[PDB]
Amino acid sequence: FDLTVGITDPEKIGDGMNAYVAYKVTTQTSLPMFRSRQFAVKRRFSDFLGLYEKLSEKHSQNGFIVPPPPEKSLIGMTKVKVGKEDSSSAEFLEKRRAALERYLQRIVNHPTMLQDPDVREFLEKEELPRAVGTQALSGAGLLKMFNKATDAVSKMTIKMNESDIWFEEKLQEVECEEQRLRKLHAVVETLVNHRKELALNTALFAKSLAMLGSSEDNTALSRALSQLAEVEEKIEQLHQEQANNDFFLLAELLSDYIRLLAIVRAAFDQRMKTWQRWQDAQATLQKKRESEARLLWANKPDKLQQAKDEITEWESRVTQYERDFERISTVVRKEVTRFEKEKSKDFKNHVMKYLETLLHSQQQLAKYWEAFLPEAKAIS
């Protein structure tokens, strides 16, 4: 609907390792679910992240993807792309703001799940939202580790279902995706390596004019070289700004593509879990109760009514699983059609960044080269 935020208020408590900021959020969307219709909240970086990961666990157990926030607490410390949570204090605040508004736009991008009242009232107020969210409670961590170790053994026969007709595309694109993101972000790290010393070389190009000041001083030469100074500074500013912004755009796109793909691979892993749930449910309910029917001639009506209500309730649970297969697959239809429209949306976003680079390149290159035109038609 309406989302126009102003990220302000750098309330720094500690500097260096994982700086926590109560930053301003100008809360739009004046729909009548939002009470005051004009309000701005503060959001403390120690507070809302843990509660949002709690709510992310909640809408993960019914089954959805999460938008990645600015990450911390073993998520923003262990190989986001390199690491360095020490740098999230003063210089990568712009990276925090960028991925923060990516997170906010992806919050907007689930309009069916946008009608969640608790997170709307929490982002609607500024209440210092429940500061116990900074946490280390990974007792489910090793649990899901050996669950992943079991799924890596027992995924194969369930892959052969109708799931294959929907997963062969995702497997092909995740193989091509990990190949192209390996190559592309390796190019990004080499860009981080050499664009900075390229900017330093442009600074030494400027200092070469003082080196010319240590030589013959002719003013016709001096005007030309002092004009070339601001020429190379404009060129350095333009393409270094492009090499910064478009490349961390594509880096954030690769990162949240990785995280959303990991979420949906985990979701199909839970669908395989529900497969083995109904499978061993049916195996116990049939084998054990036809072993009771087998043991009819231990004649009492106790195991007869036990057989009856056990097969009734537990095959009702089996039918719950076989209907929840269409429920989970329908949720999969929803979130993968969300993926096609979201891929279209952020492909449009980085392609409008490309043609926006073309547009500001057109108007900037045009304006300062026509500003250089009279001093090209005259002495430089």
From TrEMBL:
Residues 1-130 form the PX domain. One of its GO terms (biological process) is positive regulation of protein catabolic process. Its main location: other. GO terms for molecular function: epidermal growth factor receptor binding; insulin receptor binding; leptin receptor binding; phosphatidylinositol binding; protein heterodimerization activity; protein homodimerization activity; transferrin receptor binding. The keyword Cell membrane does not apply. Keywords: Acetylation, Cell projection, Endosome, Golgi apparatus, Lipid-binding, Membrane, Phosphoprotein, Protein transport, Transport. GO terms for cellular component: cytosol; early endosome membrane; Golgi apparatus; lamellipodium; lysosome; retromer, tubulation complex. It is found in: Cell projection, Lamellipodium; Early endosome membrane; Golgi apparatus, trans-Golgi network membrane. It is a peripheral membrane protein. This is Sorting nexin-1. The gene is Snx1. Belongs to the sorting nexin family.
